[PDB]
Amino acid sequence: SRVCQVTGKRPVTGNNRSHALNATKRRFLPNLHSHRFWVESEKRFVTLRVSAKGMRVIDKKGIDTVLAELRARGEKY
Amino acid sequence: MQVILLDKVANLGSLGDQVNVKAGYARNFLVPQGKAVPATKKNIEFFEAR
RNA sequence: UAAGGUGAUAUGAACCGUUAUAACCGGCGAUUUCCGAAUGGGGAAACCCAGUGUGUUUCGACACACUAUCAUUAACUGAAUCCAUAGGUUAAUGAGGCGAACCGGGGGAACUGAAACAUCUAAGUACCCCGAGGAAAAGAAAUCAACCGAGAUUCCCCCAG
RNA sequence: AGGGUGACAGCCCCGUACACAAAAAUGCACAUGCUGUGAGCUCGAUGAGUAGGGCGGGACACGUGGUAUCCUGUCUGAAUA
RNA sequence: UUUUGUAUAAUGGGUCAGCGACUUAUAUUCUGUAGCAAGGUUAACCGAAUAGGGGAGCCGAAGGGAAACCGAGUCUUAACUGGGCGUUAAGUUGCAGGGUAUAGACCCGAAACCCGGUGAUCUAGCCAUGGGCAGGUUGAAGGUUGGGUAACACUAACUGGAGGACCGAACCGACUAAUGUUGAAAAAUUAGCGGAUGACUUGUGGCUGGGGGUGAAAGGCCAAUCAAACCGGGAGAUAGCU
RNA sequence: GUUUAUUAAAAACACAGCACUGUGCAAACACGAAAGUGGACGUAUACGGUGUGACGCCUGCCCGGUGCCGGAAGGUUAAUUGAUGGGGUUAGCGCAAGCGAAGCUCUUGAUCGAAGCCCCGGUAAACGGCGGCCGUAACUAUAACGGUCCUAAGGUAGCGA
RNA sequence: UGAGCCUUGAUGUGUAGGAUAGGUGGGAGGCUUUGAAGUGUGGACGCCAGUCUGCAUGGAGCCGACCUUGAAAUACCACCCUUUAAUGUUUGAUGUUCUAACGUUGACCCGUAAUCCGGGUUGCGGACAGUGUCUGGUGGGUAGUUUGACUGGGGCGGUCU
RNA sequence: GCUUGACUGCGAGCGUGACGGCGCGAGCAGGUGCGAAAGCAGGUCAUAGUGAUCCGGUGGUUCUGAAUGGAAGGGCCAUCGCUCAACGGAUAAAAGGUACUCCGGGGA
């Protein structure tokens, strides 16, 4: 799936609006990238499918803080 | 960001100071594999006496 | 509770019982083959094919019992790579499936109306999917009011076409 | 009340109104006990990639209109009674 | 029934019996009627439950003006001899009925659009495993020998069995004609006809699903249908049409 | 050979051959939200698309138009950047008429800005085009020939009454 | 290499004139023996007019309304402007190189007698490729539709005020 | 020759249309021009020279001002942009084919 693991962003739907305002269904795809992270507590390459914003959340909280949040709400990595 | 260097980093070298740096060079070179530390006011106070 | 009674089409045959163990009704139990979530492996559903432990005054051949997957926890083990991890085994607990409406969330049209048709309307309706309960959802103010105040949410009538 | 009994039944029959009855299982009330959850007082603390903003959408009666508020895919980004 | 107009040779009916088409809700207007009257009347709800209680609110007696505002007057204008609109006429609530609005809206009927499912047991193409092709001819490359050539080339015999080869059964097709046309058959029968060792044919099982599949290309095939299958749902789609 | 099962078995369709274009392999292309498969367990003597249709003689002329392939100075040009200017608001200054600081907000959009297009050159076994007006040879007809028409150029070979 | 920005120094010939006057300010003394005017060279500017300055010669002064000039001082101190040069900070363009993101349908190792995938090592690329949001061009590949009425039948022609 | 009446607010009453509209109008109120004056002038000899509405642009007017004071916006008045030519204008935006045709009604 294309669900972000850190933030939880799911693809939602939108509409094409042209000059004549004709509606056409489309979807909002996040900017997901598989980025590899080295942790200090476990000393292991931890790969995660994160968004472009979800990488910035790791920059503030820390890689050890996010993995404690993934343990609390049930997701695995 | 405001990471503080530890080891003998080359030019932009500080030997321990708050300098500005891009985010791509902070993570994966200066954060892990070392030679720096984040500045979340818990690490820089514990490494103040170092 | 009882002198009647053995479901009905459906008689017949053979009995049971009349003062408390006939039959009938209710509560608490036992039995519950095979298929179906079907869960020992498989499968053209009601069939095929095993493994482990345990039992034979006939220890050949059968019978009793267990063995799916996943999540969580605990214990024992355990790579590349020395420590570690991945991975593997066992045990306890729990989930799977079905069901008419109501509810919450995720997707979501077109016929048609505009006397055509594209914005719009039809409409977040139908349908599909996930999840839950006897209700769910919502809910104790970063809300309304206007210098006077009211004091969570939900539902009904007005405001008001 | 109603139904049946050979035609239309208060008094023929089953019932109805009323008055009682539970071995065992079970619903709901108070009463008591146990295992757990946790009062109250004072001193703090006040929820950061968040509010807000650009672009692109959706939802509030409100179709971008002079368009607030609410939701966010993308890009950024505060203040601290 | 439709029509300027029908015995019309315009449309419809075999007959009988049963069933079958102007309704319901909520709004608003007019009329009839009833209660009260410058007032009328409650909705939800409470309830000793068609009572009683509840007057939130709606309608009306006052309108002019875009509005502020003014007021039995007011607006337009600098101001009106005026003008425009009003003032000197009783409404309101039940009930019944005639209309309109929104709902299927008097009933019956499309061809079609969209979503959710079901089918390659028929047919089109393919994949894997098997089977079938009676019989009779034409005689390639090559092999050998001989003639011939300076030598090859070339030629004459036998051997050889190549072929989207020929003729012709099974088999696979369906060109002409006839019978058949409420047939024996929702495409067949009889007699001629074409391929028939291959671009063949065929048994069994699997795969490709609808705005798609597949197609030696006809807009053909896809369960006797195909210019978009089948069935269910939106759906009582819509029709200014009969 | 193949096809309009069930009006059209053919002149159609297919066909080997030829020619052009795409494609260097994680190929082009196609099915797929994606994964991945097919292409292919192949590798330019190969694959995909288009076009003609054994073979033999051959396939002339025109690059303006419409596509494609390049080239590239100038011109225009989206997202983004938000320079100046204007307006609202007001601490304050002004008996008021009015003006106005910072802050915030609104509006205008100078500059940066790629492809595409305009422009230049090739490409006809790419799509197409291959003309009019007069004069002129025998009996006629025709025009080897002689002018004009600036649309990019005017039917060659072979044939056809 | 284009640009901002921070200090440090040049740099200014309308015209008279002791003479290639930046603009306003404070401002009749600052500076020089910790060695100055005033000449002589090199580097160097240039409208070759003239000036700046290292070194050296020289060994005690230049300066002030000085009278002129629209505007008076390299007497000095401040905000600095015009032009221009160097170092240094910073933002982009162009180009080279590297690894740590990332890609690997290269080899090898382990889970694992396993063509998936995951972990690990190594090799070649490498901030490209690719993807997400925003945006211009292309786009019957596909989808929803438009395509008028009168009318000696319809269409053409023609008309609608 | 001289001037701007091609003027502002009105208008009893009437013609003409289904309606929207259109056409004539003495006189009055205010302020002008010409003529000495009586008077005349609300465009031209009349009848053609045209386009509703919606959305806006500009100017004026304290009329409204979603707590208040303003402002944006809206209203009023003035005025601009439609060959909406199918000209009482279905959209800001629209061409062909059906001998494969399929439905509904009438016709040789």
From Swiss-Prot, chain A:
SUPFAM superfamilies: L28p-like. One of its GO terms (biological process) is ribosomal large subunit assembly. The keyword Calcium does not apply. Keywords: Ribonucleoprotein, Ribosomal protein, RNA-binding, rRNA-binding. NCBIfam families: L28 (TIGR00009). PANTHER family: 39S RIBOSOMAL PROTEIN L28, MITOCHONDRIAL, LARGE RIBOSOMAL SUBUNIT PROTEIN BL28M. Belongs to the bacterial ribosomal protein bL28 family. Part of the 50S ribosomal subunit. This is Large ribosomal subunit protein bL28. It comes from Escherichia coli (strain K12). The lineage of its organism: Bacteria, Pseudomonadati, Pseudomonadota, Gammaproteobacteria, Enterobacterales.
From Swiss-Prot, chain B:
The chain holds residues 1 to 50 of 149 of the full protein. This is Large ribosomal subunit protein bL9. Coiled coil: none annotated. One of the primary rRNA binding proteins, it binds very close to the 3' end of the 23S rRNA. It comes from the Bacteria. Part of the 50S ribosomal subunit. In stalled/collided disomes (pairs of ribosomes where the leading ribosome is stalled and a second ribosome has collided with it) bL9 in the collided ribosome contacts bS6 and uL2, while it contacts only helices of the 16S rRNA in the stalled ribosome; the inter-ribosome bridge thus formed is different from that formed between normally translating ribosomes. Belongs to the bacterial ribosomal protein bL9 family. It comes from Escherichia coli (strain K12). Signal peptide: none annotated. The gene is rplI.
